[PDB]
Write a protein that binds this ligand. Structure first.
Ligand SMILES: *[C@@H]1O[C@H](CO)[C@@H](O)[C@H](O)[C@H]1NC(C)=O
Ligand SMILES: OC[C@H]1O[C@H](O)[C@@H](O)[C@@H](O)[C@@H]1O
Ligand SMILES: *[C@H]1O[C@H](CO)[C@@H](O)[C@H](O)[C@@H]1O
Ligand SMILES: [Mg+2]
Length: 360
């Protein structure tokens, strides 16, 4: 029942165009150019991180995949999409690019967004669609409830996640709820509380057929599996995603949720990274493209290794005077200067390409 099995993952035209038009022209090394062409074809997720993407990007991606499939793709292509617009988004962050607020009709705005997405998915029932549900949402309920915006948002995040899990429970869809990463929920003291939270949400949503499990390391740089713990992970015993998931799954399964995982490895190629501290998530230096997306992970609990955050697209501006500035993007281990979040960051793309592992 692995949704990644028996299909090819669609490598979208937006990311392809960014590499061909923004990156390649500026690369002098012939070897780096050839590798950039290859990276352009690696299928990464696309994000519905703003309401305007629903009637644009989403429809365009599904339309393009249908056309490719109707022309004979074999195996058929499947879509990889991130749902990321909860109101009062990123409750514990220093800065957030979310557009809606709970105190200003955010629940009704989010329900309508989920409803329109559902309508579009129903209209593309011939396109297998894999979704990552809301990164940096429920992981905050495990450890960041001391932050007032997070304790104030908790019930809404729970209710709206349940709403999304049921409304997007469609026969051709597979959903993975975000579950932070080893350096967030993988610490031994956070494992069980996290397992209690995710298994209860699953149960409370009626164990929807489409809910396949959880996604980890989204937009982070952790290794899947390395023999030695990177210094900035100490003293966490679960220093990589394999350690985190091997400890987490049994607790989830005992509580009624035999969650299968997908793990982001888009920026996990070079280990250790250049991060000075594990919580430094913005445009981290000393990182490289990691294992390519695949359904053949060699691990019973992991449906696939994926590229969720498209390496080369910025995490946030380093301009300290900008409205959306997050201080994490101005730290010593964040590559600067950096453009606005989501915009092509060619200097970062080149870094990832040079540090790729395995190499392209
Ligand atoms: C979200 O976009 C939809 C169209 O996809 C539009 O009808 C709706 O008004 C938007 N929601 C808000 C709160 O602006
Ligand atoms: O695959 C062809 C492709 O390879 C790589 C780069 O050299 C590109 O400029 C070129 O378009
Ligand atoms: C292509 O050429 C230029 C000039 O030597 C370098 O800046 C680059 O690193 C690459 O070798
Ligand atoms: Mg083992």
């Amino acid at each position: 029942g692995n949704p990644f099995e028996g299909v090819q993952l669609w490598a979208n035209n937006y990311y392809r165009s960014e590499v061909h038009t923004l990156a390649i022209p500026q690369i002098t090394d012939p070897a780096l150019r050839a590798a950039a062409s290859a990276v352009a074809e690696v299928p990464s997720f696309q994000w519905l991180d703003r309401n305007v993407t629903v009637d644009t990007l989403l429809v365009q991606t599904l339309s393009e995949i249908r056309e490719a499939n109707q022309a004979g793709a074999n195996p058929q292509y499947a879509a990889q999409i991130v749902v990321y617009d909860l109101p009062d988004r990123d409750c514990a962050a220093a800065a957030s690019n979310g557009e809606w607020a709970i105190a200003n009709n955010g629940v009704n705005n989010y329900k309508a967004y989920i409803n329109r997405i559902r309508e579009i998915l129903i209209s593309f029932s011939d396109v297998r669609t894999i979704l990552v549900i809301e990164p940096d949402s429920l992981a905050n309920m495990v450890t960041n409830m001391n932050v007032p915006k997070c304790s104030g948002a908790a019930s809404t995040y729970r209710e709206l996640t349940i709403y999304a899990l049921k409304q997007l429970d469609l026969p051709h869809v597979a959903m993975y709820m975000d579950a932070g990463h080893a350096g967030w929920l993988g610490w031994p003291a956070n494992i069980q509380p996290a397992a209690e939270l995710f298994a209860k949400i699953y149960e409370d949503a009626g164990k929807p057929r489409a809910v396949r499990g959880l996604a980890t390391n989204v937009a982070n740089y952790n290794a899947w599996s390395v023999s030695s713990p990177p210094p900035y992970t100490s003293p966490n015993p679960n220093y990589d995603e394999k350690h985190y998931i091997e400890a987490f799954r049994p607790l989830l399964e005992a509580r009624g949720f035999p969650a299968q995982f997908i793990v982001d490895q888009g920026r996990s190629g070079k280990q250790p990274t250049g991060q000075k501290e594990w919580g430094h998530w913005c445009n981290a230096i000393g990182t490289g493209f990691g294992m390519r997306p695949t359904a053949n992970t060699g691990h019973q609990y992991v449906d696939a290794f994926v590229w969720v955050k498209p390496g080369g697209e910025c995490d946030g501006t380093s301009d300290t005077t900008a409205a959306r500035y997050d201080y994490h993007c101005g730290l010593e281990d964040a590559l600067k200067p950096a453009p606005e979040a989501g915009q092509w960051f060619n200097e970062y793309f080149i870094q990832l390409l040079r540090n790729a592992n395995p190499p392209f």
